[PDB]
Design a protein around this nucleic acid. Structure first.
Lengths: 210, 105, 1340
DNA sequence: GGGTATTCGCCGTGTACCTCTCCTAGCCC
DNA sequence: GGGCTAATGACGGCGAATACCC
RNA sequence: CGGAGAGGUA
């Protein structure tokens, strides 16, 4: 009976494989992040990359031991912000929805350190995640070795995963707000200020509308 | 629909911009409750179905580029009755022919 | 009217006069517990019924019988409040008078001795707060009322017994109130089987054999005898026209000598009528039909008695000759064939292998009790136990009543046990159903399910306790002394106490008070759970019972239920719904006489509603209650219809009588999606009290009822004038007409101030009244949490604009102005409990001390001399609160530990640190310190100080009462002493108390002076003894577990502000998180330059159907516009006449609306205060399905001088250009749900480690990692993602050495991992190898 | 003939967490 | 004390174990 | 803390 418990070999499936270097938080929309970016709270980053931050701090000589690094990070000095920017310059992170019902349910992003306490998810990706913004909480993980990071960059990131792995075709389609904006702006009227004239490329179109 | 899943003789003749009578909202509540229970049960059963399908299909990996198998399947646009439900254009995309197609003439 | 009302009138738009006010919304709990605990002069629910059923108790021999006399409830040791603050239960002792009488042994009974144990103590039962709540361990616990099928007959359709076949079967289950279930089911072959409980079926007639019945008796009970006459060839039949329609034509029916109905056809009604008018009674029938008949009784020989025909076997020509020769002219057979009780019982008897009582009893005894070689005596005993025990097989009155109705008996009640008549009747009705003319009981019909509230369950648990004590006392009386002994020598409080305590502490219906919201409380106490001990299972589909039956109309709320795995199993009681005496629910309905709807109400039951026809609550009535409509919408069975105005039986009392209190508050409920309004109601409850209570400008009018009925509102018990107002106490000088004989003096309302609710949400009461303010009975003295001026105030009113502002509102995400954070609104206080208990250990009892080893002065500097942190100190996660130390009686340790403590410089002592530090992740300010110290432990300084504060409170209350008493006494002695000569002059210069030393003329006046002197002395003595009693109450030892010495509870207060991620949701089903705190000047602003507090995605409205929030926005815009106008006039200091006329106009707005206007209020001061409370908008009361029309809203917009479309053009404070079209701006009531972003963040890289399964788990100082479930592994698998699976499974999940070395590598400055030998693989390899199985490592 | 067509016991349980309880037991020294 | 110590108001599947028409 | 029982949320 110790050969097999539920759901099977204990250490390879349920239960329950909770893993470190991960976090979980409710999600907000950031409409300024680029498609390969996710907005991640500064405290979340600070506590997700403490070992990397310690390594950098002792690398710059700013700390002489792990105790000094602990004090240095907990004192929230302005120096650790540069350290965290360095360790997060391009270190990506993996966001997974609580139920993953298709391949895109987990995707990588480049984290941008933000104020707040929620994960600013790319607005155009949440449709692929089959998520919403109703208090539902996303989960972050950090692929923390080089080779996992590259596995994330080449494959996990939303840029390289834009078509549905179910029927092809983009899964990154504008869903509800940006589509409204475009439908409004591209509509036509039969009479309005600025009707009928000729303009030198869209140069003058932008100039005259603005 | 009503309890037992049959359509009511009198529809919900009221909008949301206009008001809803008490009995109308009562009747409408049946559908919402039915839908929510359906949602929960379908979530559970979909999880189970994903599990069984993954278990049956997981040991399958593309490992060779070409086996030279000129065998294949007839692959046609599905048409029911007079209406063409799906175009062969959609299906053919992303496949590899098992023979060299000719012109219809 | 009401004084609290006249302070702030919430304008109503209801148009139908409200006959019958909203009843007390906790009536269910109060009714249940009063029925349970009151005295009963008869056998009725409660302790009286339990005792009368269990008692008297008789010895096996000795005539030593214990007789019940009376029960009295012991006065509780504590009131509700100090039960809360001491962590004990609110319990009243139970004392019962019992007389043990011993007669002569043995003679005609006459007592030899009687010993009367008066008020024997067999347990102290919990008592209810009068707010439908039970304090169990110092916490508010509620007995969630259960909805369970009523005892009685249960006619259902068996659809799973078909086993891949049609013709769904029938079943009839007898469910006793207690005892053994009974089951009569069919089979696909029309055979009737009996299952006692679930045990394997037997033929039904076996019970009849055990019930002393012969085959002939069984056949006589069910089948009607068919008479066959021995005369002429082929014999004759006494033709019966009532047997020609229950059978087919399988014989020649003749009339006047000619066969009118030939064999082969189907007999029609026309054929029967023509035969009857032909007047033929004896018909020539073929002998084959005679053979096909099955005889109903045995027939033997007339001389030798040899059996030739026996009951329930078919006839034959040989048997015909045998009966003819033995002597027979009449033959009585069965009336068989489908229709009219077909031969199902005959088939059962053919299946039944028994024909006599003993064999049936043997079989039943063996199948109830497997093996166990049967004894007919044991079988008889078991059968009597199962269906004729008067002490453990009960149907109760409700079961008997439902049973008789299911059998449609003319009886109304009867025996609580089962009888042969009951079983034969239920079989008859089941056979009738099988015949296709009976009814199948609806499984979910509320006329077939009943409410078991707290009282019934409590008395059932007390009955079980009485059963255990009864067994004990029955053993003792027979075993015990025949001489005098005391009746308390065999009564133990342990069984009853344990049963009752378990029920009220850990039953699946004793739930913690869902206490973060007065709505939350008042709907939790009205919760109706289909689950429970005797109810459904959490997993139940159940699709019909999850779904709403059409009999829930006005009994439970169809639209309020949790969205989890138990939707529909957990209902909430309607507003007007209540429980009948039996337990079934009823709804009030106005009686409609002939065309007049009387204000008289009848509480129609669930089944009563079925027979009657009820008009809709939206009928329009003029005159004295006549419909303006000759055709009116009605409901007869659950479906709508249009019926004549003179054919309706009853009317819904209110338009809102079909929603819960949670759903009733949602405004414009008639504009939301039912599902979306369901989310809205579920989010009503989850609102958390903000920093201030803010009325909703758009409401329903039930806010006052909910606020008052819930106990969070200090309601004035007795009317009077407020003598004293303070932040903690309210002192009412009661009106003398409501004063009691003697002097009850003042009424003191102590207010709960910053006490942790069960959801860690701060509850406190703000005194809304001021000095000298008159109050009458039933008005608010102090607003509770989430309550303003006696109005339920769940959330706060925000300025809202609906437009997708720069994509920061994507799905439902909500953008908030920085102004909201400025105003500190939506700011919430939260209270933590960090319970630090001192323990008694084998190495030394733990001590709470201020001197802690190996800590600095900073940690000690926040503590007093007693080791408990100062009240009011600002602390953060990690700081020491309670200086707990455990005497380290074990000084011997491993050399490694000693070397480590020597090298690291840590202190070495014979006591180890155990202090409770602030958990990492919480902070705040300490507001309460509670010390629980049971007798035998010294009272430290903090305990002494809290005792002194409590004594000061009690002393102040008693001293104010003493003040009023001695004021009256000294006034009357002054009046006496002034009379009887000139004595007032020195009386004025003498102190008030020094009038007892001044002389008086020796008369009756002097006698009265002396008498009042003794009165003053007696009142003084009453004062000191009351103070002493309070000191005993506050000083006595806590009810603490013996292993525990003291309890030190510290309360942490955090004031959480709204911020990105907070699921701050609307009332109508609106959802969303705080998107971003964009600055005040970036907010859109109107021409006036007024920014907008909230920007909502307009995408959520046209998809989720909840356009109710848009109507709320427009109406709130109008209301706040009226508020702006009135505020401008206040700043303009307009004439009081101007305010009066404008407010009268505002309230007069709308047609057929009854709200009534000034001047009936006070001319100036009341009008001034009303305007001052109205300067932030008109609170608008909108009945859910009887509310405001769009035209009325636009009228209010005109009166506010704001746009008629509710749309005004903003300017983007970012750019500063008006948007191309005007947008919708208004005021929306928004709720901050308890899902706070601080409660949802948790992230880690290291921290807690578990055993067995090495993975981060447990704790809240650093919570564990995320469950990387198999779905996530599968998502990685579908991608070419391989390695990340390896790290998330191997190197950062389980392997401790790998995690340590890999963390070391990262700290070294390089992201390093090497596959090598997977540790889990090696473990499993050794594990398989130990099985004598070698695993080869062959490479492909 | 023989395949349904019943009866006769065991057992499994979407996703994640928040709180709570409950965990081989018999027993001779 | 303690150190040893060998079912019914879930639901569905499923093999074993019976149940039955021609 | 290893796995079962219960409420709530998503």
């Amino acid at each position: 009976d110790m050969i097999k418990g539920k759901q099977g070999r204990f250490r390879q499936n349920l239960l329950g494989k909770r893993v470190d270097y991960s976090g979980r938080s409710v999600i907000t929309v950031g409409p300024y992040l680029r498609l390969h970016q996710c907005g991640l709270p500064k405290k979340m980053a600070l506590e997700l990359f403490k070992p990397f931050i310690y390594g950098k701090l002792e690398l710059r000589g700013l700390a002489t031991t792990i105790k000094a690094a602990k004090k240095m990070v907990e004192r929230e000095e302005a120096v650790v912000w540069d350290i965290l920017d360095e360790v997060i310059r391009e270190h990506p992170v993996l966001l997974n929805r609580a139920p993953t019902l298709h391949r895109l349910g987990i995707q990588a992003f480049e984290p941008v350190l933000i104020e707040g306490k929620a994960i600013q998810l790319h607005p155009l990706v949440c449709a692929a995640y089959n998520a919403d913004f109703d208090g539902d909480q996303m989960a972050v993980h950090v692929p923390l070795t080089l080779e996992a990071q590259l596995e994330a960059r080449a494959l996990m990131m939303s840029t390289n995963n834009i078509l549905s792995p179910a029927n092809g075709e983009p899964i990154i389609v504008p869903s509800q707000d940006v589509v409204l904006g475009l439908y409004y702006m591209t509509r036509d009227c039969v009479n309005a200020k600025g009707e009928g004239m000729v303009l030198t490329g869209p140069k003058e179109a932008e100039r005259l509308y603005r | 629909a009503k309890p037992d899943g049959s359509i009511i003789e009198t529809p919900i003749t009221a909008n949301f911009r206009e008001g809803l009578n008490v009995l109308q909202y009562f009747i409408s509540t049946h559908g919402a409750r039915k839908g929510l229970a359906d949602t929960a049960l379908k979530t559970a059963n979909s999880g189970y179905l994903t599990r069984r399908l993954v278990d049956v299909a997981q040991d399958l990996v593309v490992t060779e580029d070409d086996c030279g198998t000129h065998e294949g399947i007839m692959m046609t646009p599905v048409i029911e009755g007079g209406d063409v439900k799906e175009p062969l254009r959609d299906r053919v995309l992303g496949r590899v022919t098992a023979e060299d197609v000719l012109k219809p003439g | 009217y009401s004084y609290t009302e006249k302070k702030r009138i919430r304008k109503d738009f209801g148009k139908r006069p409200q006959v019958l006010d909203v009843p007390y919304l906790l009536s269910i709990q109060l009714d249940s517990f009063q029925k349970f605990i009151e005295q009963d002069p008869e056998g009725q629910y409660g302790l009286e019924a339990a005792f009368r059923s269990v008692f008297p108790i008789q010895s096996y021999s000795g005539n030593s019988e214990l007789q019940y006399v009376s029960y009295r409830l012991g006065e509780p040791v504590f009131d509700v409040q100090e039960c809360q603050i001491r962590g004990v239960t609110y319990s009243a002792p139970l004392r019962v008078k019992l007389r043990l009488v011993i007669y002569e042994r043995e003679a005609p009974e006459g007592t030899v001795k009687d010993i009367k144990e008066q008020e024997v103590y067999m347990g102290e039962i919990p008592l209810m707060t009068d707010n439908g709540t039970f304090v169990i361990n110092g916490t508010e616990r509620v007995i969630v009322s259960q909805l369970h099928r009523s005892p009685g007959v249960f006619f259902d359709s068996d659809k799973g017994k078909t086993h891949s076949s049609g013709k769904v079967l029938y079943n009839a289950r007898i469910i006793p109130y207690r005892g053994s279930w009974l089951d009569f089911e069919f089979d696909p072959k029309d055979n009737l089987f009996v299952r006692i409980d679930r045990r394997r079926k037997l033929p039904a007639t076996i019970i009849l054999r055990a019930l002393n019945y012969t085959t002939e008796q069984i056949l006589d009970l069910f089948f009607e005898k068919v008479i066959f006459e021995i005369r002429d060839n082929k014999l004759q039949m006494e033709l019966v026209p009532e047997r020609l329609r229950g059978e087919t034509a399988s014989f020649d029916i003749e009339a006047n000598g000619k066969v009118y109905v030939e064999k082969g056809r189907r007999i029609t009604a026309r054929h029967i009528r023509q035969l009857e008018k032909d007047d033929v009674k004896l018909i020539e029938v073929p002998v084959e039909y005679i053979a096909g008949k099955v005889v109903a009784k045995d027939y033997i020989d007339e001389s030798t008695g040899e059996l030739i025909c026996a009951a329930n076997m078919e006839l034959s020509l040989d048997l015909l000759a045998k009966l003819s020769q033995s002597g027979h002219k009449r033959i009585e057979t069965l009336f068989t064939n489908d229709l009219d009780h077909g031969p199902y019982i005959s088939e059962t008897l053919r299946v039944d292998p028994t024909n006599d009582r003993l064999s049936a009893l043997v079989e039943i005894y063996r199948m109830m009790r497997p093996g166990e070689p049967p004894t007919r005596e044991a079988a008889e005993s078991l059968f009597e136990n199962l269906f004729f025990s008067e002490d453990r097989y009960d149907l109760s009155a409700v079961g008997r009543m439902k049973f008789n109705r299911s059998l449609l008996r003319e009886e109304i009640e009867g025996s609580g046990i089962l009888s042969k008549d009951d079983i034969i009747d239920v079989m008859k009705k089941l056979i009738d159903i099988r015949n296709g003319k009976g009814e199948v009981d609806d499984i979910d019909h509320l006329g077939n399910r009943r409410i078991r509230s707290v009282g019934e369950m409590a008395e059932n648990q007390f009955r079980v306790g009485l059963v255990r004590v009864e067994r004990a006392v029955k053993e003792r009386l027979s075993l015990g002394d025949l001489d005098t002994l005391m009746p308390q020598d065999m009564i133990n409080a342990k069984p009853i106490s344990a049963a009752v305590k378990e029920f009220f502490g850990s039953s699946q219906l004793s739930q913690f008070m869902d206490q973060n919201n007065p709505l939350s409380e008042i709907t939790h106490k009205r919760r109706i759970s289909a689950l429970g001990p005797g109810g459904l299972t959490r997993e139940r589909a159940g699709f019909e019972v999850r779904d709403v039956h059409p009999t829930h109309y006005g009994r439970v709320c169809p639209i309020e239920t949790p969205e989890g795995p138990n939707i529909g199993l957990i209902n909430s009681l309607s507003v007007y719904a209540q429980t009948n005496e039996y337990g079934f629910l009823e709804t009030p309905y106005r009686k409609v006489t002939d065309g007049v709807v009387t204000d008289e109400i009848h509480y129609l039951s669930a089944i009563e509603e079925g027979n009657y026809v009820i008009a809709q609550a939206n009928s329009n009535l003029d005159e004295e209650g006549h419909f303006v409509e000759d055709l009116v919408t009605c409901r007869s069975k659950g479906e709508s219809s249009l019926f004549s105005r003179d054919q309706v039986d009853y009317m819904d009392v209110s338009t809102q009588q079909v929603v819960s209190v949670g759903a009733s508050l949602i405004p414009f409920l008639e504009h939301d999606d039912a599902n979306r309004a369901l989310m809205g109601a579920n989010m009503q409850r989850q609102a958390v009290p903000t920093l201030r209570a803010d009325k909703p400008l758009v409401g329903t009018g039930m806010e006052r009822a909910v606020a008052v009925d819930s106990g969070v509102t200090a309601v004035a018990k007795r009317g009077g004038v407020v003598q004293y107002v303070d932040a903690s106490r309210i002192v009412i000088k009661v009106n003398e007409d409501e004063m009691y004989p003697g002097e009850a003096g003042i009424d003191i309302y102590n207010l709960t101030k910053y006490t942790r609710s069960n959801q860690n949400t701060c509850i406190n009461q703000m005194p809304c009244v001021s000095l000298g303010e008159p109050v009458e009975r039933g008005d608010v003295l102090a607003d509770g949490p989430s309550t303003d001026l006696g109005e339920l105030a769940l959330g706060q009113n925000m300025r809202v604009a609906f437009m997708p502002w720069n994509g920061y509102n994507f799905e439902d995400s909500i953008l908030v102005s920085e102004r909201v954070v400025q105003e500190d609104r939506f700011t919430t206080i939260h209270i933590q409990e960090l319970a630090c208990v001192s323990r008694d250990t084998k190495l030394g009892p733990e001590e709470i001390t201020a001197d802690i080893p190996n800590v600095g002065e900073a940690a000690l500097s926040k503590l007093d001399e007693s080791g408990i942190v100062y009240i009011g100190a600002e602390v953060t996660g990690g700081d020491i609160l309670v200086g707990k130390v455990t005497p380290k009686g074990e000084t011997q340790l491993t050399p490694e530990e000693k070397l480590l403590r020597a090298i690291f410089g840590e202190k070495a002592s014979d006591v180890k640190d155990s202090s409770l530090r602030v958990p990492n992740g919480v902070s705040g300010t300490v507001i309460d310190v509670q010390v629980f110290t049971r007798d035998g432990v010294e009272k430290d300084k903090r305990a002494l100080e809290i005792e002194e504060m409590q004594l000061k409170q009690a002393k102040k209350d008693l001293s104010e009462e003493l003040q009023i008493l001695e004021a009256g006494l000294f006034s009357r002695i002054r009046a006496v002493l002034v009379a009887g000569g000139v004595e007032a002059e020195k009386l004025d210069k003498l102190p008030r108390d020094r009038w007892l030393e001044l002389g008086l003329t020796d008369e009756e006046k002097q006698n009265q002076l002396e008498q009042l002197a003794e009165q003053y002395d007696e009142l003084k003595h009453e004062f000191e003894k009351k103070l002493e009693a309070k000191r005993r109450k506050i000083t006595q030892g806590d009810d603490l577990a013996p292993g525990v010495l003291k309890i030190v509870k510290v309360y942490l207060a955090v004031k959480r502000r709204i911020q990105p991620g907070d699921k701050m949701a609307g009332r109508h089903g609106n959802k969303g998180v705080i998107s971003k705190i964009n600055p005040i000047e970036d907010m859109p602003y109107d021409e006036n330059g007024t920014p907008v507090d909230i920007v909502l995605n307009p995408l959520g409205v046209p998809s989720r159907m909840n356009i109710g929030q848009i109507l709320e926005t427009h109406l709130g815009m109008a209301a706040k516009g009226i508020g702006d106008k009135i505020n401008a006039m206040l700043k303009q200091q307009q004439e009081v006449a101007k305010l009066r006329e404008f407010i009268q106009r505002a309230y007069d707005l709308g047609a057929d609306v009854r709200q009534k206007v000034d001047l009936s209020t006070f001319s100036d001061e009341e009008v001034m205060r009303l305007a001052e409370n109205l300067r932030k908008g008109m609170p608008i009361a909108t009945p859910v399905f009887d509310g405001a029309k769009e035209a009325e809203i636009k009228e209010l917009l005109k009166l506010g001088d704001l746009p008629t479309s509710g749309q005004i053009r903003l300017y983007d404070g970012r750019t500063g250009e008006q948007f191309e079209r005007p947008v919708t701006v208004g005021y929306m009531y928004m709720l901050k749900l308890n899902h706070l972003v601080d409660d949802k963040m948790h992230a880690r890289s290291t921290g807690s480690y578990s055993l067995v399964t090495q993975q981060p788990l447990g704790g809240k100082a650093q919570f564990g990692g995320q469950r990387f479930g198999e779905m996530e592994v599968w998502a990685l698998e579908a991608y070419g993602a391989a390695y990340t699976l390896q790290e998330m499974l191997t190197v950062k999940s389980d392997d401790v050495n790998g995690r340590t070395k890999m963390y070391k590598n990262i700290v070294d400055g390089n992201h390093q991992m090497e596959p090598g030998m997977p540790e889990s693989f090696n473990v499993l390899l050794k594990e398989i190898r130990s099985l004598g199985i070698n695993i080869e490592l062959e490479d492909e």
